[PDB]
């Protein structure tokens, strides 16, 4: 199991 | 709603449309 973590410009919730 | 991609236009599915300007009110 691989977990990706996105941090684009968004309201991070 | 935290949706917030982008918006430019809209339409509906009797009714009125006004717009909003940057004003200053005393409430």
């Amino acid at each position: 199991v691989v977990l990706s973590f996105e941090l684009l410009h968004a309201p991070a919730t | 709603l935290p949706i917030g991609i982008n918006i430019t236009r809209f339409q509906t599915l009797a009714y009125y449309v006004g717009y909003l300007q940057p004003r200053t009110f005393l409430l």
Side-chain angles (χ1 to χ4, degrees):
Chain A
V1 174
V2 58
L3 298 175
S4 177
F5 292 99
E6 286 83 5
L7 197 61
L8 70 151
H9 179 71
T13 50
Chain B
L1 300 182
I3 305 302
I5 294 97
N6 215 165
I7 192 168
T8 306
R9 295 182 290 169
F10 76 105
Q11 61 172 353
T12 181
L13 292 174
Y15 66 95
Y16 306 94
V17 170
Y19 284 155
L20 304 179
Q21 281 92 18
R23 290 298 180 93
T24 300
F25 288 12
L26 183 70
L27 299 170

